[PDB]
mmCIF file of all heavy atoms in Angstrom:
data_model
loop_
_atom_site.group_PDB
_atom_site.id
_atom_site.type_symbol
_atom_site.label_atom_id
_atom_site.label_comp_id
_atom_site.label_asym_id
_atom_site.label_seq_id
_atom_site.Cartn_x
_atom_site.Cartn_y
_atom_site.Cartn_z
ATOM 1 N N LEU D 21 4.235 37.482 171.186
ATOM 2 C CA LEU D 21 3.603 38.789 171.314
ATOM 3 C C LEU D 21 2.132 38.737 170.924
ATOM 4 O O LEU D 21 1.589 39.713 170.406
ATOM 5 C CB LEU D 21 4.338 39.834 170.474
ATOM 6 C CG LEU D 21 5.616 40.430 171.066
ATOM 7 C CD1 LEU D 21 6.272 41.384 170.082
ATOM 8 C CD2 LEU D 21 5.322 41.132 172.372
ATOM 9 N N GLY D 25 -2.408 43.042 171.123
ATOM 10 C CA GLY D 25 -3.547 43.763 170.595
ATOM 11 C C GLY D 25 -4.770 43.652 171.479
ATOM 12 O O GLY D 25 -5.717 44.434 171.347
ATOM 13 N N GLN D 38 6.807 36.711 177.651
ATOM 14 C CA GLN D 38 7.668 37.823 177.275
ATOM 15 C C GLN D 38 8.832 38.028 178.232
ATOM 16 O O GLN D 38 9.828 38.647 177.846
ATOM 17 C CB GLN D 38 6.862 39.123 177.184
ATOM 18 C CG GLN D 38 5.982 39.216 175.957
ATOM 19 C CD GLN D 38 4.518 39.005 176.269
ATOM 20 O OE1 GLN D 38 4.099 39.103 177.420
ATOM 21 N NE2 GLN D 38 3.730 38.710 175.243
ATOM 22 N N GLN D 49 11.063 34.272 169.184
ATOM 23 C CA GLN D 49 11.472 35.671 169.093
ATOM 24 C C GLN D 49 11.635 36.125 167.645
ATOM 25 O O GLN D 49 11.166 37.200 167.264
ATOM 26 C CB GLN D 49 12.779 35.886 169.864
ATOM 27 C CG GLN D 49 13.331 37.298 169.797
ATOM 28 C CD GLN D 49 14.529 37.420 168.879
ATOM 29 O OE1 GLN D 49 15.145 36.422 168.505
ATOM 30 N NE2 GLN D 49 14.866 38.648 168.513
ATOM 31 N N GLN D 73 28.185 38.994 167.078
ATOM 32 C CA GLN D 73 27.572 38.115 168.070
ATOM 33 C C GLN D 73 27.822 38.618 169.484
ATOM 34 O O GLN D 73 26.883 38.767 170.279
ATOM 35 C CB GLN D 73 28.126 36.697 167.928
ATOM 36 C CG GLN D 73 27.814 36.005 166.622
ATOM 37 C CD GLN D 73 26.343 35.700 166.475
ATOM 38 O OE1 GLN D 73 25.640 36.355 165.713
ATOM 39 N NE2 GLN D 73 25.868 34.701 167.210
ATOM 40 N N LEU D 100 6.707 39.084 188.979
ATOM 41 C CA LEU D 100 6.312 39.805 187.774
ATOM 42 C C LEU D 100 5.285 40.889 188.078
ATOM 43 O O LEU D 100 5.350 41.983 187.508
ATOM 44 C CB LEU D 100 5.762 38.826 186.737
ATOM 45 C CG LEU D 100 6.635 37.609 186.426
ATOM 46 C CD1 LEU D 100 5.797 36.484 185.845
ATOM 47 C CD2 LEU D 100 7.762 37.981 185.479
ATOM 48 N N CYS D 102 3.715 43.193 191.151
ATOM 49 C CA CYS D 102 3.954 43.631 192.516
ATOM 50 C C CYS D 102 3.059 44.816 192.835
ATOM 51 O O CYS D 102 2.643 45.561 191.944
ATOM 52 C CB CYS D 102 5.419 44.013 192.746
ATOM 53 S SG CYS D 102 5.842 44.248 194.487
ATOM 54 N N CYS D 103 2.768 44.978 194.120
ATOM 55 C CA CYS D 103 1.961 46.079 194.621
ATOM 56 C C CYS D 103 2.843 46.987 195.463
ATOM 57 O O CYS D 103 3.715 46.510 196.195
ATOM 58 C CB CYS D 103 0.790 45.558 195.454
ATOM 59 S SG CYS D 103 -0.094 44.181 194.692
ATOM 60 N N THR D 104 2.637 48.295 195.343
ATOM 61 C CA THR D 104 3.452 49.272 196.054
ATOM 62 C C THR D 104 2.551 50.228 196.826
ATOM 63 O O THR D 104 1.320 50.153 196.759
ATOM 64 C CB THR D 104 4.368 50.042 195.096
ATOM 65 O OG1 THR D 104 3.597 50.558 194.004
ATOM 66 C CG2 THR D 104 5.469 49.137 194.558
ATOM 67 N N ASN D 105 3.181 51.136 197.569
ATOM 68 C CA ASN D 105 2.481 52.075 198.433
ATOM 69 C C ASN D 105 2.381 53.476 197.846
ATOM 70 O O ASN D 105 1.895 54.382 198.528
ATOM 71 C CB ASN D 105 3.172 52.147 199.799
ATOM 72 C CG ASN D 105 3.024 50.867 200.592
ATOM 73 O OD1 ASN D 105 2.580 49.846 200.069
ATOM 74 N ND2 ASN D 105 3.397 50.913 201.866
ATOM 75 N N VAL D 106 2.830 53.681 196.612
ATOM 76 C CA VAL D 106 2.786 55.002 195.989
ATOM 77 C C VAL D 106 1.359 55.289 195.536
ATOM 78 O O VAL D 106 0.794 54.515 194.751
ATOM 79 C CB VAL D 106 3.773 55.098 194.815
ATOM 80 C CG1 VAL D 106 3.549 56.382 194.035
ATOM 81 C CG2 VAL D 106 5.200 55.027 195.323
ATOM 82 N N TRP D 108 -1.730 56.968 193.441
ATOM 83 C CA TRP D 108 -1.872 57.372 192.046
ATOM 84 C C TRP D 108 -2.308 58.830 191.989
ATOM 85 O O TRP D 108 -3.418 59.172 192.409
ATOM 86 C CB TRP D 108 -2.875 56.470 191.332
ATOM 87 C CG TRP D 108 -2.961 56.705 189.853
ATOM 88 C CD1 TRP D 108 -3.983 57.307 189.179
ATOM 89 C CD2 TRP D 108 -1.991 56.340 188.865
ATOM 90 N NE1 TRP D 108 -3.709 57.341 187.833
ATOM 91 C CE2 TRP D 108 -2.491 56.753 187.614
ATOM 92 C CE3 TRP D 108 -0.747 55.704 188.915
ATOM 93 C CZ2 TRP D 108 -1.792 56.551 186.428
ATOM 94 C CZ3 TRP D 108 -0.054 55.505 187.735
ATOM 95 C CH2 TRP D 108 -0.578 55.927 186.509
ATOM 96 N N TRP D 121 -8.563 49.155 182.227
ATOM 97 C CA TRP D 121 -8.205 47.743 182.196
ATOM 98 C C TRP D 121 -9.047 46.915 181.232
ATOM 99 O O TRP D 121 -8.757 45.729 181.052
ATOM 100 C CB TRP D 121 -8.316 47.139 183.598
ATOM 101 C CG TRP D 121 -7.208 47.537 184.509
ATOM 102 C CD1 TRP D 121 -7.248 48.487 185.484
ATOM 103 C CD2 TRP D 121 -5.885 46.992 184.532
ATOM 104 N NE1 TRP D 121 -6.031 48.570 186.114
ATOM 105 C CE2 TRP D 121 -5.177 47.662 185.547
ATOM 106 C CE3 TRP D 121 -5.231 46.004 183.792
ATOM 107 C CZ2 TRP D 121 -3.849 47.374 185.841
ATOM 108 C CZ3 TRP D 121 -3.912 45.721 184.084
ATOM 109 C CH2 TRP D 121 -3.235 46.403 185.099
ATOM 110 N N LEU D 127 0.215 49.202 174.519
ATOM 111 C CA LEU D 127 0.869 50.161 173.633
ATOM 112 C C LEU D 127 0.258 51.550 173.770
ATOM 113 O O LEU D 127 0.983 52.546 173.875
ATOM 114 C CB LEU D 127 0.777 49.706 172.176
ATOM 115 C CG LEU D 127 1.667 48.618 171.571
ATOM 116 C CD1 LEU D 127 1.303 47.226 172.046
ATOM 117 C CD2 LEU D 127 1.582 48.702 170.063
ATOM 118 N N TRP D 129 -1.518 52.661 176.351
ATOM 119 C CA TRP D 129 -1.262 53.133 177.708
ATOM 120 C C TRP D 129 0.169 53.626 177.873
ATOM 121 O O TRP D 129 0.408 54.590 178.610
ATOM 122 C CB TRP D 129 -1.560 52.024 178.717
ATOM 123 C CG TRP D 129 -1.225 52.383 180.136
ATOM 124 C CD1 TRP D 129 -0.254 51.825 180.911
ATOM 125 C CD2 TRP D 129 -1.872 53.369 180.952
ATOM 126 N NE1 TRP D 129 -0.247 52.405 182.154
ATOM 127 C CE2 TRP D 129 -1.232 53.356 182.205
ATOM 128 C CE3 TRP D 129 -2.927 54.263 180.744
ATOM 129 C CZ2 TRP D 129 -1.612 54.201 183.246
ATOM 130 C CZ3 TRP D 129 -3.302 55.101 181.777
ATOM 131 C CH2 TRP D 129 -2.646 55.065 183.012
ATOM 132 N N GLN D 148 10.230 52.795 198.860
ATOM 133 C CA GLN D 148 10.903 51.583 199.316
ATOM 134 C C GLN D 148 12.025 51.905 200.302
ATOM 135 O O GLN D 148 12.259 51.132 201.239
ATOM 136 C CB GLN D 148 11.428 50.787 198.114
ATOM 137 C CG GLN D 148 12.353 49.610 198.443
ATOM 138 C CD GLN D 148 11.648 48.426 199.093
ATOM 139 O OE1 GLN D 148 10.420 48.358 199.145
ATOM 140 N NE2 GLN D 148 12.435 47.486 199.601
ATOM 141 N N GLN D 151 10.283 52.481 203.587
ATOM 142 C CA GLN D 151 9.812 51.184 204.073
ATOM 143 C C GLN D 151 10.954 50.358 204.662
ATOM 144 O O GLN D 151 10.798 49.736 205.721
ATOM 145 C CB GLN D 151 9.123 50.432 202.934
ATOM 146 C CG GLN D 151 8.942 48.943 203.157
ATOM 147 C CD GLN D 151 8.129 48.295 202.059
ATOM 148 O OE1 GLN D 151 7.262 48.929 201.459
ATOM 149 N NE2 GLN D 151 8.407 47.026 201.786
ATOM 150 N N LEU E 28 -6.504 54.329 194.354
ATOM 151 C CA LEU E 28 -5.675 53.733 193.316
ATOM 152 C C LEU E 28 -4.202 53.808 193.699
ATOM 153 O O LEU E 28 -3.727 54.842 194.165
ATOM 154 C CB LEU E 28 -5.908 54.434 191.978
ATOM 155 C CG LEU E 28 -7.341 54.430 191.447
ATOM 156 C CD1 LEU E 28 -7.455 55.296 190.203
ATOM 157 C CD2 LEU E 28 -7.789 53.014 191.158
ATOM 158 N N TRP E 29 -3.479 52.708 193.499
ATOM 159 C CA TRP E 29 -2.063 52.643 193.825
ATOM 160 C C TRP E 29 -1.283 52.121 192.629
ATOM 161 O O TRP E 29 -1.820 51.402 191.781
ATOM 162 C CB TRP E 29 -1.799 51.752 195.045
ATOM 163 C CG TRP E 29 -2.696 52.023 196.216
ATOM 164 C CD1 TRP E 29 -3.947 51.519 196.427
ATOM 165 C CD2 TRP E 29 -2.403 52.854 197.345
ATOM 166 N NE1 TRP E 29 -4.454 51.990 197.612
ATOM 167 C CE2 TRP E 29 -3.526 52.811 198.197
ATOM 168 C CE3 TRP E 29 -1.304 53.632 197.718
ATOM 169 C CZ2 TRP E 29 -3.579 53.515 199.395
ATOM 170 C CZ3 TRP E 29 -1.359 54.330 198.910
ATOM 171 C CH2 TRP E 29 -2.489 54.268 199.734
ATOM 172 N N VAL E 30 -0.006 52.496 192.569
ATOM 173 C CA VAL E 30 0.849 52.098 191.458
ATOM 174 C C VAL E 30 1.245 50.637 191.620
ATOM 175 O O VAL E 30 1.714 50.218 192.686
ATOM 176 C CB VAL E 30 2.087 53.003 191.387
ATOM 177 C CG1 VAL E 30 2.956 52.639 190.196
ATOM 178 C CG2 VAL E 30 1.674 54.460 191.322
ATOM 179 N N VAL E 32 3.565 47.617 189.553
ATOM 180 C CA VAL E 32 4.637 47.476 188.576
ATOM 181 C C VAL E 32 4.501 46.119 187.900
ATOM 182 O O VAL E 32 4.500 45.079 188.570
ATOM 183 C CB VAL E 32 6.016 47.630 189.232
ATOM 184 C CG1 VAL E 32 7.114 47.515 188.193
ATOM 185 C CG2 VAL E 32 6.107 48.957 189.962
ATOM 186 N N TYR E 33 4.394 46.129 186.576
ATOM 187 C CA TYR E 33 4.272 44.922 185.775
ATOM 188 C C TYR E 33 5.538 44.715 184.955
ATOM 189 O O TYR E 33 6.030 45.646 184.306
ATOM 190 C CB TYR E 33 3.061 44.999 184.842
ATOM 191 C CG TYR E 33 1.723 44.863 185.531
ATOM 192 C CD1 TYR E 33 1.126 45.952 186.152
ATOM 193 C CD2 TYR E 33 1.053 43.648 185.551
ATOM 194 C CE1 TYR E 33 -0.099 45.833 186.779
ATOM 195 C CE2 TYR E 33 -0.173 43.518 186.177
ATOM 196 C CZ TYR E 33 -0.741 44.614 186.789
ATOM 197 O OH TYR E 33 -1.960 44.492 187.414
ATOM 198 N N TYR E 34 6.055 43.490 184.989
ATOM 199 C CA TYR E 34 7.231 43.095 184.227
ATOM 200 C C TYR E 34 6.808 42.113 183.147
ATOM 201 O O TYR E 34 6.033 41.190 183.412
ATOM 202 C CB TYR E 34 8.288 42.456 185.131
ATOM 203 C CG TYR E 34 9.626 42.251 184.459
ATOM 204 C CD1 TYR E 34 10.390 43.333 184.050
ATOM 205 C CD2 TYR E 34 10.119 40.974 184.223
ATOM 206 C CE1 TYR E 34 11.611 43.154 183.430
ATOM 207 C CE2 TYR E 34 11.339 40.784 183.603
ATOM 208 C CZ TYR E 34 12.078 41.879 183.210
ATOM 209 O OH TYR E 34 13.293 41.699 182.593
ATOM 210 N N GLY E 35 7.319 42.308 181.935
ATOM 211 C CA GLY E 35 6.974 41.444 180.827
ATOM 212 C C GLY E 35 5.796 41.890 179.996
ATOM 213 O O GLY E 35 5.168 41.052 179.342
ATOM 214 N N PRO E 37 3.750 43.529 176.840
ATOM 215 C CA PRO E 37 4.061 43.570 175.392
ATOM 216 C C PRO E 37 4.049 44.970 174.777
ATOM 217 O O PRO E 37 3.149 45.369 174.043
ATOM 218 C CB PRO E 37 2.965 42.689 174.791
ATOM 219 C CG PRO E 37 1.821 42.831 175.721
ATOM 220 C CD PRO E 37 2.395 43.008 177.097
ATOM 221 N N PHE E 47 21.982 39.518 162.871
ATOM 222 C CA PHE E 47 22.949 38.475 162.559
ATOM 223 C C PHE E 47 22.413 37.527 161.493
ATOM 224 O O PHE E 47 21.223 37.206 161.468
ATOM 225 C CB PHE E 47 23.360 37.738 163.842
ATOM 226 C CG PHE E 47 22.328 36.780 164.394
ATOM 227 C CD1 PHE E 47 22.344 35.427 164.066
ATOM 228 C CD2 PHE E 47 21.409 37.219 165.335
ATOM 229 C CE1 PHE E 47 21.410 34.557 164.603
ATOM 230 C CE2 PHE E 47 20.474 36.353 165.876
ATOM 231 C CZ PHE E 47 20.479 35.019 165.512
ATOM 232 N N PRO E 214 18.539 39.975 167.271
ATOM 233 C CA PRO E 214 19.135 39.517 168.534
ATOM 234 C C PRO E 214 18.111 39.361 169.647
ATOM 235 O O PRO E 214 16.910 39.553 169.433
ATOM 236 C CB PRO E 214 20.154 40.615 168.861
ATOM 237 C CG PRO E 214 19.641 41.824 168.179
ATOM 238 C CD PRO E 214 18.922 41.362 166.949
ATOM 239 N N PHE E 217 14.825 41.810 170.939
ATOM 240 C CA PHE E 217 14.341 42.567 169.794
ATOM 241 C C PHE E 217 13.299 41.733 169.046
ATOM 242 O O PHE E 217 13.007 40.592 169.412
ATOM 243 C CB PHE E 217 15.506 42.967 168.887
ATOM 244 C CG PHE E 217 16.335 44.103 169.422
ATOM 245 C CD1 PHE E 217 17.307 43.878 170.385
ATOM 246 C CD2 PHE E 217 16.145 45.394 168.960
ATOM 247 C CE1 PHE E 217 18.070 44.921 170.879
ATOM 248 C CE2 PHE E 217 16.906 46.441 169.448
ATOM 249 C CZ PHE E 217 17.867 46.203 170.409
ATOM 250 N N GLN E 240 10.522 35.225 163.446
ATOM 251 C CA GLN E 240 11.849 34.938 163.979
ATOM 252 C C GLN E 240 12.935 35.524 163.085
ATOM 253 O O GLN E 240 13.751 36.341 163.526
ATOM 254 C CB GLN E 240 12.032 33.427 164.132
ATOM 255 C CG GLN E 240 13.360 33.018 164.742
ATOM 256 C CD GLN E 240 13.542 33.540 166.148
ATOM 257 O OE1 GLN E 240 14.290 34.489 166.376
ATOM 258 N NE2 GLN E 240 12.868 32.912 167.103
ATOM 259 N N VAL E 488 3.846 50.605 184.601
ATOM 260 C CA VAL E 488 3.202 50.985 185.851
ATOM 261 C C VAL E 488 1.727 51.242 185.570
ATOM 262 O O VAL E 488 1.355 51.763 184.514
ATOM 263 C CB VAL E 488 3.876 52.213 186.508
ATOM 264 C CG1 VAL E 488 5.246 51.837 187.043
ATOM 265 C CG2 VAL E 488 4.013 53.359 185.517
ATOM 266 N N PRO E 490 -2.413 51.909 187.539
ATOM 267 C CA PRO E 490 -3.187 52.093 188.771
ATOM 268 C C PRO E 490 -4.122 50.922 189.033
ATOM 269 O O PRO E 490 -4.857 50.473 188.151
ATOM 270 C CB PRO E 490 -3.974 53.383 188.509
ATOM 271 C CG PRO E 490 -4.064 53.494 187.033
ATOM 272 C CD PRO E 490 -2.949 52.699 186.416
ATOM 273 N N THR E 491 -4.082 50.426 190.269
ATOM 274 C CA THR E 491 -4.893 49.290 190.683
ATOM 275 C C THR E 491 -5.254 49.503 192.149
ATOM 276 O O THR E 491 -4.437 50.013 192.922
ATOM 277 C CB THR E 491 -4.132 47.968 190.468
ATOM 278 O OG1 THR E 491 -3.781 47.841 189.086
ATOM 279 C CG2 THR E 491 -4.986 46.756 190.823
ATOM 280 N N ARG E 495 0.440 47.255 199.131
ATOM 281 C CA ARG E 495 1.327 46.291 199.765
ATOM 282 C C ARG E 495 1.173 46.356 201.279
ATOM 283 O O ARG E 495 1.152 47.445 201.862
ATOM 284 C CB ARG E 495 2.773 46.569 199.350
ATOM 285 C CG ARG E 495 3.840 46.156 200.350
ATOM 286 C CD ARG E 495 5.185 46.771 200.001
ATOM 287 N NE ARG E 495 5.563 46.525 198.615
ATOM 288 C CZ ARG E 495 6.581 47.113 198.001
ATOM 289 N NH1 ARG E 495 7.342 48.001 198.621
ATOM 290 N NH2 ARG E 495 6.843 46.802 196.736
#
Side-chain angles (χ1 to χ4, degrees):
Chain D
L21 280 177
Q38 286 105 17
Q49 178 255 344
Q73 296 292 106
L100 309 158
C102 191
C103 314
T104 51
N105 292 11
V106 170
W108 187 253
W121 285 101
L127 282 73
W129 176 247
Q148 170 71 11
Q151 163 174 330
Chain E
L28 302 173
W29 312 84
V30 183
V32 181
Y33 287 82
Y34 191 65
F47 75 94
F217 284 81
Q240 183 62 255
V488 290
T491 301
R495 152 194 308 170

